[PDB]
Each structure stands twice: as structure tokens, then as C-alpha cells.
Amino acid sequence: GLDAVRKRPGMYIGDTDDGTGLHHMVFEVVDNAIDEALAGHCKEIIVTIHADNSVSVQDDGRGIPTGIHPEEGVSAAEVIMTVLGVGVSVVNALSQKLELVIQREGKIHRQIYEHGVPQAPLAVTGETEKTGTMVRFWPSLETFTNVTEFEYEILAKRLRELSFLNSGVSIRLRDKRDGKEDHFHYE
């Protein structure tokens, strides 16, 4: 399944050779946080372009569920990240690495994937007084060509739009490569 997406990435994510698909990856992750905002449980989304060719999307929602199915021994989070609004599992499949961190029920949970394949089970990594979900991913350089870096104005245009289409949600955009920051929120 993840193999399928890796074989024909352009079908799932858009053109892989001109930056379209690259940016669609970010928007799919953001759409999941927006859905949590539409459900009334997320007030702020922070999108960060890091200086190591990754993007992170952090929300202050309920957190992705962290329970385990007792007979399968697989977490809900893993199911969400690995099984086929094209969906975050596609993003995962087309990422050399993806990091999920969930803050929920007083605990921090984390899992790492490479090309969609989990590296270890979802694990507890601390305690927290906050809630929400963070996805950070490093796009596959076997998939994307020509435009392999995130472009601030593409994200800024669309995040601004998302903030006015979902009035009340605060969307912050941050670029670690030059300190640029924007705050999109509409009343």
C-alpha cells in the first residue's frame, strides 16, 4: 500500500517535479489540524519551516489517540499514519522520515517512521500539561526533484486562506532559515 504510493507518487500527491506535490504534503498535514479546529478542539496551528529540510505542523487539539488494540498490539496513531483529503499516511509514505509527537492525557507519545515504516512502537517520552499533535517530516529526495525545499510564499498564501475560511483559528507560519514569521487569524 505504501509501496503503491511510492510507485506512483504523482497520482496521490500531485506533480513531484515542480514543487506542487511537495507543498501539498504540508497542506495534507495542516488539513488534519484544521479538522480538529472545525470539531471545536483546536485554537492554534503553528507551521514551521526548519533549517534541515523538514516542516512541522503543531496543533493544540485533543491529540491523536494513543491507545493500543490489545490483540493486534498496534496503536491507533500508527494505524492513522500507515493505512490508506488524500491523507497523512500518503505524506508518511513519501517522507524519508516522519516524526509524530502527541500530547494527551498528561503524557508525551512519540513515533518515528522512515518511508512510512514505523521504526519502533509508539512510546511515552515525558509528561505534559498540554494537549495536541505535532507532525514533522523530511520529504523523500527519491520522490521530489527540482523543488526539494519548502517555499515560504506558497505556504503563506494557503495558510492565510485557511485562516479566513475557518474564522477564529490562529495559524502561525515560521521560517527557521531566516526568522520570518506570520500570524493569520480573522474575526
Ligand SMILES: CCNC(=O)Nc1cc(-n2cc(Br)cn2)c(C(=O)Nc2cccnc2)cn1
Ligand atoms: C499536525 C496534524 N494534526 C492532527 O492530526 N491533529 C489531530 C488529529 C486527530 N485525529 C484524526 C484522526 Br483519524 C484521529 N485523530 C485528532 C483527534 O481526533 N483526536 C481525538 C478525538 C477524540 C478522542 N480522542 C482523540 C486530534 N488532532
